[PDB]
Every structure is written in C-alpha cells, then in structure tokens.
From Swiss-Prot:
This is GMP synthase [glutamine-hydrolyzing] subunit A. GO terms for molecular function: ATP binding; GMP synthase (glutamine-hydrolyzing) activity. The keyword DNA repair does not apply. InterPro entries: Class_I_gatase-like (IPR029062), GATASE (IPR017926), GMP_synth_GATase (IPR004739), GMP_synthase_A (IPR023686). Catalyzes the synthesis of GMP from XMP. CDD domains: GATase1_GMP_Synthase. The active site is at C76 (nucleophile), H163, E165. The gene is guaAA.
Length: 188
C-alpha cells in the first residue's frame, strides 16, 4: 500500500480514491507521522506527500524526503518540500488559481510512461521550484513553469507541480500507476 501524508490540501481524498480505482490500497495519515512509524510497516511500498497550503506546517515531510528508504511522490507542496529538503529553492510565481496547463514531458522517464509528450494537467502555480536541487533533473515544464516535474537522479523520489489525482489531469491515473510501478506493483 501507499501512505499519503495529508499536508492539508482539499484533493488528499482524490489521491486515495484514484489509487483504489487502479487497485492499489492507501492510507491517509497526519503529515506529522514520524518516518520511523511509516517504515515499521513493511506493507507500505511508497509515500505520497500531498498538496497543502503552508510549507512551515509540513516541516516533517523534509525528514521523510531526506531519510525515507521508500519511493516518494511530492504533489504541488510535496514537490516543493522535496526541493527544499535537498537544498533546492522555492518561491511565489503566479497568482493563485487552478487552471488546465499544457505540460511538455522533456525526457523519457518511468513517471511518464504511456503519457503523451504533451498533456493537459490541473495545476495551481501560486508557488514553484525556483532552483532544482543538486543531483535532480527536470522531467517536464509548461510555458509558465520551468519545473512541472523533477526526479532525484539516484533515489526513487518524484515531484509534480500539478495534481494527477484529479480527473481534469489527462493520464493522471497513469502517472500514479507509474509511481506505484516503482513501488513494486504490476498492472498487467
């Protein structure tokens, strides 16, 4: 199963339901849950750091991003938290508003397998990754966001600025499916 850290955003339940829909179990836990309690249960195959409003009140995600021995997906705030954790930079970009963003996939990566190189994703751009951490690379961009997605070149850590877990993201479930594949699931 996948543990979802609830960073307080309103789509946390859409993560659980989207995963269940492709036949993966998941559990929403408070974002203050210690990494050591998550990793005590060998049933936990991966961690998703959800979207939420305040990075200061998701400080515990920094420890999980740095020190977890399981695959991680950061969604919006989770993406930004991964960035900060590894000494990248994060800041205000555009106005607050959810919009369909045309996203370009810039390289061949496991996270976007069976996703067209061009797809519409549901995203806010209140905040964005400004400098990608050392030893990470950009997987995707839009006209307004240089870092729509990134991965750790040597750990199984993935960041998306957008929300794959809402139906408004084309191939959103596919992107979740792909992360689950890194976490040991097969979808034959």
């Amino acid at each position: 199963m996948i543990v979802i850290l609830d960073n307080g955003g309103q789509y946390v339940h859409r993560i659980h339901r989207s995963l269940k829909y492709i036949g993966v179990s998941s559990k929403i836990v408070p974002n203050t849950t210690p990494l050591e309690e998550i990793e005590s249960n060998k049933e936990v195959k991966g961690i998703i750091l959800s979207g939420g409003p305040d990075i200061e009140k998701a400080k515990n995600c920094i420890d999980i991003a740095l020190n977890a021995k399981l695959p991680i997906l950061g969604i919006c705030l989770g993406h930004q938290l991964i960035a900060l954790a590894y000494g990248g930079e994060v800041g205000r970009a555009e106005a607050e508003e959810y919009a369909l963003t045309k996203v370009y996939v810039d390289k061949e990566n496991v996270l976007f397998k069976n996703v067209p190189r061009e797809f519409n994703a549901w995203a806010s751009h209140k905040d964005e990754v400004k400098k990608v951490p050392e030893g990470f690379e950009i997987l995707a961009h839009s006209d307004i966001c240089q870092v729509e997605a990134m991965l750790h070149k040597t750990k199984p850590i993935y960041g998306v600025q957008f929300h794959p877990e809402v139906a408004h993201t084309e191939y959103g479930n596919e992107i979740l499916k792909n992360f689950c594949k890194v976490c040991g699931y097969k979808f034959e």
